[PDB]
JSON list of C-alpha atoms in Angstrom, two decimals:
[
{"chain": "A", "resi": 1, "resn": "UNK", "atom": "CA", "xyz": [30.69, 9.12, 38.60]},
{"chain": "A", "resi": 2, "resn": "UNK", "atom": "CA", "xyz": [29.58, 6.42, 36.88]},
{"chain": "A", "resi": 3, "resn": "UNK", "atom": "CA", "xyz": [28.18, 5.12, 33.27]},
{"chain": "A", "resi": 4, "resn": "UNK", "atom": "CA", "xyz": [26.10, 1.69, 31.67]},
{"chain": "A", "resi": 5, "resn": "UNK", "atom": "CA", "xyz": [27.32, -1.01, 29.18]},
{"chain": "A", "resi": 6, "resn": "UNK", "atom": "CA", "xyz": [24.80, -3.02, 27.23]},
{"chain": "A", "resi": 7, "resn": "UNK", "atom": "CA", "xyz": [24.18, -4.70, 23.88]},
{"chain": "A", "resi": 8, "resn": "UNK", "atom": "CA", "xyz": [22.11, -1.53, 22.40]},
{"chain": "A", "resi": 9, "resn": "UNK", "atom": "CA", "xyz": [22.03, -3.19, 19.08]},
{"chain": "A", "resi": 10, "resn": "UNK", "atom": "CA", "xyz": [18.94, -5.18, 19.99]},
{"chain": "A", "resi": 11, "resn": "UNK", "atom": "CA", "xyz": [17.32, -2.07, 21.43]},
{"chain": "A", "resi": 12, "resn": "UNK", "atom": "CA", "xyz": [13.76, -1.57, 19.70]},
{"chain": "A", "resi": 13, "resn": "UNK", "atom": "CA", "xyz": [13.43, 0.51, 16.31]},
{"chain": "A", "resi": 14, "resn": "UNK", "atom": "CA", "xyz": [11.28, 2.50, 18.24]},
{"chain": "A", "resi": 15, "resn": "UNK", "atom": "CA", "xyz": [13.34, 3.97, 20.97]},
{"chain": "A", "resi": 16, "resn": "UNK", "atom": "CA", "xyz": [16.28, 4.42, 18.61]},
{"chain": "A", "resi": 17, "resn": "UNK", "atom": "CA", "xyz": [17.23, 8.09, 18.17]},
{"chain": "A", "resi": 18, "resn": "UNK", "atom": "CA", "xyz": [17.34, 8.04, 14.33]},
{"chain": "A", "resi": 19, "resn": "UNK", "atom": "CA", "xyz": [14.01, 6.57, 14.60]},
{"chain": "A", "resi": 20, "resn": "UNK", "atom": "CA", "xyz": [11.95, 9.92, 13.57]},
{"chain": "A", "resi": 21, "resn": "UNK", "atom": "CA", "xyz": [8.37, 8.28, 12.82]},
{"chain": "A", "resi": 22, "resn": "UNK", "atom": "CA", "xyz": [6.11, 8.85, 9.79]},
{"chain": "A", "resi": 23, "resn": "UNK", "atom": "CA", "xyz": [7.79, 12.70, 9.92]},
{"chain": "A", "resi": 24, "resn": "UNK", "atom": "CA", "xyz": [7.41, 14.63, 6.32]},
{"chain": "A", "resi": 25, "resn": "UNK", "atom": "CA", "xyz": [10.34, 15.06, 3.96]},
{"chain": "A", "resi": 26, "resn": "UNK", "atom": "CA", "xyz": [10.74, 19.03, 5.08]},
{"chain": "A", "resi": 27, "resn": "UNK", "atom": "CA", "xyz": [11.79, 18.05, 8.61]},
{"chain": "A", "resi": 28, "resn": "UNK", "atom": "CA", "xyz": [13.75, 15.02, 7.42]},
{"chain": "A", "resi": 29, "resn": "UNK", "atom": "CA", "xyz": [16.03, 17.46, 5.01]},
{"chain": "A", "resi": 30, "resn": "UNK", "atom": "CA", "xyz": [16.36, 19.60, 8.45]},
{"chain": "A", "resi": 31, "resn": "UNK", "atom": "CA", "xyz": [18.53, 16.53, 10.25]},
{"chain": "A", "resi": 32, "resn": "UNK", "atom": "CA", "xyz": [21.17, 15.45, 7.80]},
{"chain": "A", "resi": 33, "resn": "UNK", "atom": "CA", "xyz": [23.84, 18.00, 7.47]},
{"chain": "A", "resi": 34, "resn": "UNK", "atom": "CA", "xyz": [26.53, 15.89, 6.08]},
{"chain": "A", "resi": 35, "resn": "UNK", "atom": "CA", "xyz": [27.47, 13.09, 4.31]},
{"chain": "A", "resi": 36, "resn": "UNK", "atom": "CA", "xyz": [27.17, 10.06, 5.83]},
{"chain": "A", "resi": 37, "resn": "UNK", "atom": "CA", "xyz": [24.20, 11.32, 8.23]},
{"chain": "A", "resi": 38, "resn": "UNK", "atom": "CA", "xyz": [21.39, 9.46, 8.41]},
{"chain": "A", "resi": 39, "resn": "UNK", "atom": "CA", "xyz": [17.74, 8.38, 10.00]},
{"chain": "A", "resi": 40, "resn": "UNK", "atom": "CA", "xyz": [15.13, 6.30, 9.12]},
{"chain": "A", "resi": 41, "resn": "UNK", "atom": "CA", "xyz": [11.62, 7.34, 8.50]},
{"chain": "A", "resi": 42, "resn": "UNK", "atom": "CA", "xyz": [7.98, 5.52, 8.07]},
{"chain": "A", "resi": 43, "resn": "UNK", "atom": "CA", "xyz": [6.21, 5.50, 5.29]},
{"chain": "A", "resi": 44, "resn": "UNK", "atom": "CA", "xyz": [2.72, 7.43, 4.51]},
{"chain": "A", "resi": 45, "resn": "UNK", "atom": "CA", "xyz": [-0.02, 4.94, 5.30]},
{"chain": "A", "resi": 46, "resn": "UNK", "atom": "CA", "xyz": [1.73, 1.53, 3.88]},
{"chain": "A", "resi": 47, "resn": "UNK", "atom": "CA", "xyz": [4.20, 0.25, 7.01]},
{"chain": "A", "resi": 48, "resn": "UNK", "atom": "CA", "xyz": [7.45, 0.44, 5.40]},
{"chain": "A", "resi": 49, "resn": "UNK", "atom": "CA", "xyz": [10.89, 2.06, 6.98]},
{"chain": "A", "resi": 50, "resn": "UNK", "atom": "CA", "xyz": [12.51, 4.32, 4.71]},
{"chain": "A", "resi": 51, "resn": "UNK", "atom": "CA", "xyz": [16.42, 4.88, 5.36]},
{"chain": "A", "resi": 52, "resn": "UNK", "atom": "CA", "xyz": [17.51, 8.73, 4.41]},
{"chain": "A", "resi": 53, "resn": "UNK", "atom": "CA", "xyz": [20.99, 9.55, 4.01]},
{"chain": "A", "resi": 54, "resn": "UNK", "atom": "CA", "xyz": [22.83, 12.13, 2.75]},
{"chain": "A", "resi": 55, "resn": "UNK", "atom": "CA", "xyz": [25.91, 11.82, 0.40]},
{"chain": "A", "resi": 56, "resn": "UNK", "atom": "CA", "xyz": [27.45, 14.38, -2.16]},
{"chain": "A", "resi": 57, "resn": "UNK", "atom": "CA", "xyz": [24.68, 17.07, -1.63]},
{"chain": "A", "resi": 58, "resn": "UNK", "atom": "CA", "xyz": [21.72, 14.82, -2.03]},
{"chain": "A", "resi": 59, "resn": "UNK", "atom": "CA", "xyz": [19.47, 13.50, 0.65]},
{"chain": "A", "resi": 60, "resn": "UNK", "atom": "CA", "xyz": [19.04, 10.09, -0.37]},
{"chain": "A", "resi": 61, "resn": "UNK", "atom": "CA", "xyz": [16.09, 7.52, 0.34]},
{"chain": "A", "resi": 62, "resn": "UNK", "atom": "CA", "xyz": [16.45, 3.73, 0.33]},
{"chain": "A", "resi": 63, "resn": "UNK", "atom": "CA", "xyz": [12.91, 2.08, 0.49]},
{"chain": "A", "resi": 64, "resn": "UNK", "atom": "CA", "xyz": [14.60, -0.92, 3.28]},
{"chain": "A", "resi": 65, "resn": "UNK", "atom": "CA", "xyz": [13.48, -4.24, 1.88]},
{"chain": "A", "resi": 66, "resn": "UNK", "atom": "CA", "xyz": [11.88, -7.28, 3.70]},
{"chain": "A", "resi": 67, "resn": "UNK", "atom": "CA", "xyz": [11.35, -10.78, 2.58]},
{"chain": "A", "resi": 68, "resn": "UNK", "atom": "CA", "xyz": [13.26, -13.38, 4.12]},
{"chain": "A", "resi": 69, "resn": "UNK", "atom": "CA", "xyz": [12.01, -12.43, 7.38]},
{"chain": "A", "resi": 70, "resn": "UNK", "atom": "CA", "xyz": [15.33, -10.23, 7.59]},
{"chain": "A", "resi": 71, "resn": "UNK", "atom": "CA", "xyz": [15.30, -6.74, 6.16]},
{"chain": "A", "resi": 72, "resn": "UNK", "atom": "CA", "xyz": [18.54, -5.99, 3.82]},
{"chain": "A", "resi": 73, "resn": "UNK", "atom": "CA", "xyz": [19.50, -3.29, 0.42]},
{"chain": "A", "resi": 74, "resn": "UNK", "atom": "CA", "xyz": [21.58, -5.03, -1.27]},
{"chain": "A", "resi": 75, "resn": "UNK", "atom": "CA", "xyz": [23.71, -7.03, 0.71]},
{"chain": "A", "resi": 76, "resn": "UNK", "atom": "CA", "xyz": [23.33, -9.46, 4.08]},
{"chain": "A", "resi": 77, "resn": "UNK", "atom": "CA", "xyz": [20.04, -8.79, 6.00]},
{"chain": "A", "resi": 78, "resn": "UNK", "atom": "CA", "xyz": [19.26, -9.42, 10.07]},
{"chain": "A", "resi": 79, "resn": "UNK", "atom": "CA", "xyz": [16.35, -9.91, 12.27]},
{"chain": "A", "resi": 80, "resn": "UNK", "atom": "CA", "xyz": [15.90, -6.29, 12.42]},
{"chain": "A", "resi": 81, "resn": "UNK", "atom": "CA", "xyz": [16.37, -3.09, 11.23]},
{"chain": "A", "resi": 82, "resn": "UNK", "atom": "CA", "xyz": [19.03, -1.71, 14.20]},
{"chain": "A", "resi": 83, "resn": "UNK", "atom": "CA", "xyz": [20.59, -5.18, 13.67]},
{"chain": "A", "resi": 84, "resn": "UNK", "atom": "CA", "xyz": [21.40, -4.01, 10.11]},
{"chain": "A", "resi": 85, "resn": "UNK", "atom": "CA", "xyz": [22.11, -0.34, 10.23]},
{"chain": "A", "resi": 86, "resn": "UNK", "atom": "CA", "xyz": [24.72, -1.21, 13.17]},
{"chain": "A", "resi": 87, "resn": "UNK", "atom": "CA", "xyz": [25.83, -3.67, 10.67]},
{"chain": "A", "resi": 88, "resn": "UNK", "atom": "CA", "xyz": [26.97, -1.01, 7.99]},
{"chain": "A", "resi": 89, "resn": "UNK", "atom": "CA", "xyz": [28.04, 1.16, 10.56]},
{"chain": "A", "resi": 90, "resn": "UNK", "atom": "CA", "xyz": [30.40, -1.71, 11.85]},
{"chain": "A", "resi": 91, "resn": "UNK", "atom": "CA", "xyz": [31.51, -2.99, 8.46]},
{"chain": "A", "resi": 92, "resn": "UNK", "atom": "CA", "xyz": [30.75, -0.28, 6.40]},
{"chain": "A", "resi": 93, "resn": "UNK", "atom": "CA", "xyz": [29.50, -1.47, 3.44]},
{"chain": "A", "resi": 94, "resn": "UNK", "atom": "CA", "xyz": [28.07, 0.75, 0.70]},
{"chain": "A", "resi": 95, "resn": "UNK", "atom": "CA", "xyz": [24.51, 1.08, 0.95]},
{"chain": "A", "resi": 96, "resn": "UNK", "atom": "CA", "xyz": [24.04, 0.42, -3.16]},
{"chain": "A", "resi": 97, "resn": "UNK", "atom": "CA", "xyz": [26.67, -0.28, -5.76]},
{"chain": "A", "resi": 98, "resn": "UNK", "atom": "CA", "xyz": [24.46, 2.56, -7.58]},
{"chain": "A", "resi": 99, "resn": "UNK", "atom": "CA", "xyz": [25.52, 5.08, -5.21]},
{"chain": "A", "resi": 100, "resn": "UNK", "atom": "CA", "xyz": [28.73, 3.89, -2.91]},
{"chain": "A", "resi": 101, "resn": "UNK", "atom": "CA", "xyz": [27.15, 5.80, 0.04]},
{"chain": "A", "resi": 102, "resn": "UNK", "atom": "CA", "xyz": [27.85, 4.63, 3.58]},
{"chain": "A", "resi": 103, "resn": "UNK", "atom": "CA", "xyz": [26.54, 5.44, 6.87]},
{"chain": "A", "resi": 104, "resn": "UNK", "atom": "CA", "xyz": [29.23, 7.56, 9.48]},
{"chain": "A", "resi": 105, "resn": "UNK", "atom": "CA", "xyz": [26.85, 8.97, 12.19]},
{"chain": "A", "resi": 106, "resn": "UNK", "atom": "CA", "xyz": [22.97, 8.68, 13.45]},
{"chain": "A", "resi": 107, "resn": "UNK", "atom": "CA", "xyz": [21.06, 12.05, 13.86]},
{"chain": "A", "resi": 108, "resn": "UNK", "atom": "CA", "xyz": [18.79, 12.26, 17.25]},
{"chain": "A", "resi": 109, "resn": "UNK", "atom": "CA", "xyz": [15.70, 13.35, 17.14]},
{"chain": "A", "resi": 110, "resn": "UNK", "atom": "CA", "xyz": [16.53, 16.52, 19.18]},
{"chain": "A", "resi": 111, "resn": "UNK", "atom": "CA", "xyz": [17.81, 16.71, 22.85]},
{"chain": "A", "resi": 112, "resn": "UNK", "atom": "CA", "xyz": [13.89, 16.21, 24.28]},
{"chain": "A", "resi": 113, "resn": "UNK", "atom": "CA", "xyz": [15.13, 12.50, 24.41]},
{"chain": "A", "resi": 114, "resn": "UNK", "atom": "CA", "xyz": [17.79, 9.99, 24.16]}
]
């Protein structure tokens, strides 16, 4: 048959499949299984994207930070949030010296779409 080759990186936050929307913590806890699984969620209200992993039993949440026009955690930053998480998933760089957790695999939303 046949398949498609593009630069998905730049694809929009909001087409992403570990982009899950403003969804409550009870159905984010429902997606991470193991560690190195992770989305990222929206905030209640305030527009800020909240990265949930899980690591060591824990799902963890890292408020993602913006201010020099590229979002970062505490390393490099880029344009965007995909260009970022791709990042760590290329290089994999711990998220936080706090922690040491990295990111290994996205969770979809569910098989509805993708």
């Amino acid at each position: 048959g046949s398949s498609g080759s593009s630069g998905e990186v730049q694809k929009p936050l909001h087409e992403q499949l570990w982009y899950h929307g403003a969804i409550p913590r009870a159905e984010v806890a429902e997606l991470l299984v193991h560690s190195g699984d992770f989305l990222v969620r929206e905030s209640q209200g305030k527009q800020e994207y909240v990265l949930s992993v899980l690591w060591d039993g824990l799902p963890r949440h890292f408020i993602i930070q913006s201010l020099d026009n590229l979002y970062r955690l505490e390393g490099e930053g880029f344009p965007s949030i995909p260009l970022l998480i791709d990042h760590l998933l290329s290089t994999q760089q711990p998220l936080t010296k706090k922690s040491g957790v990295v990111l290994h695999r996205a969770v979809p939303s569910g098989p509805s779409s993708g």
